[PDB]
Amino acid sequence: KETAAAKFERQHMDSSTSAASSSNYCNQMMKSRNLTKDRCKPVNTFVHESLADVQAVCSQKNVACKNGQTNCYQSYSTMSITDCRETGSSKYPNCAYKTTQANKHIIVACEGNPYVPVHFDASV
Amino acid sequence: KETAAAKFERQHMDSSTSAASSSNYCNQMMKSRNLTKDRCKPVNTFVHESLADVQAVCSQKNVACKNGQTNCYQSYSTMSITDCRETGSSKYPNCAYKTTQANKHIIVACEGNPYVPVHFDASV
Ligand SMILES: O[C@@H]1CO[C@@H]2OCC[C@@H]21
Ligand SMILES: O[C@@H]1CO[C@@H]2OCC[C@@H]21
Ligand SMILES: O[C@@H]1CO[C@@H]2OCC[C@@H]21
Ligand SMILES: O[C@@H]1CO[C@@H]2OCC[C@@H]21
Numbered sequence: 559k560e561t562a563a564a565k566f567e568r569q570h571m572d573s574s575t576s577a578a579s580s581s582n583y584c585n586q587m588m589k590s591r592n593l594t595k596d597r598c599k600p601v602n603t604f605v606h607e608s609l610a611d612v613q614a615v616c617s618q619k620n621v622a623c624k625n626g627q628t629n630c631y632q633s634y635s636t637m638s639i640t641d642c643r644e645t646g647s648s649k650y651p652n653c654a655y656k657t658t659q660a661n662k663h664i665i666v667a668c669e670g671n672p673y674v675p676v677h678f679d680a681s682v
Numbered sequence: 683k684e685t686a687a688a689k690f691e692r693q694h695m696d697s698s699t700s701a702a703s704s705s706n707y708c709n710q711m712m713k714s715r716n717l718t719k720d721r722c723k724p725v726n727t728f729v730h731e732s733l734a735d736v737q738a739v740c741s742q743k744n745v746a747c748k749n750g751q752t753n754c755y756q757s758y759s760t761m762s763i764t765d766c767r768e769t770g771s772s773k774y775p776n777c778a779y780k781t782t783q784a785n786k787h788i789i790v791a792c793e794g795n796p797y798v799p800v801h802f803d804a805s806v
């Protein structure tokens with residue numbers, strides 16, 4: 559199995575590009591990151607910043623997670639992100655995603671020692 | 683009990699202002715909209731557009747909800763919104779919220795006849 563931290567990296571980190579390259583970005587990334595393997599993951603966000611910048615969020619603004627847990631953190635600054643969301647004719651195993659690029663604060667849940675992101679809660 | 687539609691209006695509609703008026707906007711609105719009555723609701727978004735503009739989202743871009751349901755819709759345009767999130771010393775019944783104003787697409791789940799918003803899924 560993956561560690562929680564490694565799974566966060568796989569699902570949510572894209573430090574290789576400053577933003578989505580095209581309207582097919584999500585189709586490509588959801589597939590290559592193994593998020594369409596056993597089902598179509600309905601919604602997923604990729605962050606276009608360094609791993610260090612995203613891990614740093616765990617020592618930024620402490621806020622409540624959507625479920626009421628206390629280990630969530632909101633980035634002080636906005637970050638380049640891409641929201642990927644299933645759309646239209648999407649039906650496993652023929653997944654299809656809408657790509658929406660934006661610049662927003664991210665909110666992540668952190669755990670462990672070292673204290674690192676393990677869930678993407680939301681973006682604002 | 684409230685209808686689902688009326689509950690959405692109570693939790694999520696603020697057509698009276700173009701944006702959050704101050705850093706205390708969320709403290710005021712979470713209280714006056716009864717979201718701190720029996721507990722501190724951890725996270726909640728208010729939309730600063732007409733009720734008609736928000737209801738109109740139900741006939742815009744059909745996308746998957748975070749849970750995989752198919753009745754979610756993403757606004758074609760961005761809208762003025764305020765994210766309210768519990769912060770710091772927040773402990774029922776002394777709720778405390780961080781106010782973050784932004785301009786984003788909204789995603790809502792719709793139901794019924796007439797087909798209207800019943801849940802706020804996310805914003806991008
Ligand atoms: O390293 C960071 C991660 O993504 C940004 O755009 C390209 C490089 C920048
Ligand atoms: O808007 C985002 C922020 O930085 C990226 O470079 C091109 C656009 C991307
Ligand atoms: O097309 C836009 C412009 O720059 C971004 O980096 C990858 C492609 C994005
Ligand atoms: O960054 C966004 C994502 O895809 C669009 O087409 C290229 C740039 C636009």
Ligand SMILES: O[C@@H]1CO[C@@H]2OCC[C@@H]21
Nearest residue numbers: 582585586589652653654
């Ligand atoms: O374009 C890419 C290539 O393969 C992905 O699955 C469908 C289309 C996606």
Ligand SMILES: O[C@@H]1CO[C@@H]2OCC[C@@H]21
Nearest residue numbers: 574575579582583586587
């Ligand atoms: O699919 C997208 C398109 O550009 C990114 O770099 C590698 C693949 C990524």
Ligand SMILES: O[C@@H]1CO[C@@H]2OCC[C@@H]21
Nearest residue numbers: 610611613614615616617
């Ligand atoms: O918080 C983590 C710990 O190491 C990274 O470099 C700076 C911040 C990142």
Ligand SMILES: O[C@@H]1CO[C@@H]2OCC[C@@H]21
Nearest residue numbers: 620621627628629630668
């Ligand atoms: O409530 C506080 C907020 O962050 C600390 O670490 C986890 C919970 C502790």
Ligand SMILES: O[C@@H]1CO[C@@H]2OCC[C@@H]21
Nearest residue numbers: 603641679680681804805
């Ligand atoms: O975390 C979820 C995934 O997509 C949504 O956009 C903002 C955050 C929401």
Ligand SMILES: O[C@@H]1CO[C@@H]2OCC[C@@H]21
Nearest residue numbers: 697698699700730731732
């Ligand atoms: O009616 C709409 C709802 O909120 C906007 O700013 C004030 C009026 C506008």
Ligand SMILES: O[C@@H]1CO[C@@H]2OCC[C@@H]21
Nearest residue numbers: 700701702761762784785
């Ligand atoms: O940014 C939002 C969009 O419209 C509002 O008027 C003042 C700022 C508010």
Ligand SMILES: O[C@@H]1CO[C@@H]2OCC[C@@H]21
Nearest residue numbers: 698699700701702703704
């Ligand atoms: O202060 C800003 C400027 O205009 C917005 O409408 C209410 C207050 C907001």
Ligand SMILES: O[C@@H]1CO[C@@H]2OCC[C@@H]21
Nearest residue numbers: 701702703704705781783
């Ligand atoms: O709109 C945002 C929300 O609160 C800030 O102070 C007033 C305007 C700023």
Ligand SMILES: O[C@@H]1CO[C@@H]2OCC[C@@H]21
Nearest residue numbers: 706709710713776777778
């Ligand atoms: O400022 C307002 C007034 O009452 C709310 O609960 C705490 C503070 C909030």
Ligand SMILES: O[C@@H]1CO[C@@H]2OCC[C@@H]21
Nearest residue numbers: 698699703706707710711
């Ligand atoms: O609390 C906020 C401050 O301004 C809005 O109009 C009525 C109260 C709302």
Ligand SMILES: O[C@@H]1CO[C@@H]2OCC[C@@H]21
Nearest residue numbers: 734735737738739740741
């Ligand atoms: O979709 C709903 C139905 O009535 C409202 O006025 C236009 C759109 C709104």
Ligand SMILES: O[C@@H]1CO[C@@H]2OCC[C@@H]21
Nearest residue numbers: 744745751752753754792
């Ligand atoms: O799958 C489609 C998408 O919208 C229709 O109404 C509910 C589900 C139907």
Ligand SMILES: O[C@@H]1CO[C@@H]2OCC[C@@H]21
Nearest residue numbers: 680681727765803804805
């Ligand atoms: O719906 C939730 C509530 O707050 C988050 O900001 C974007 C949407 C997320």
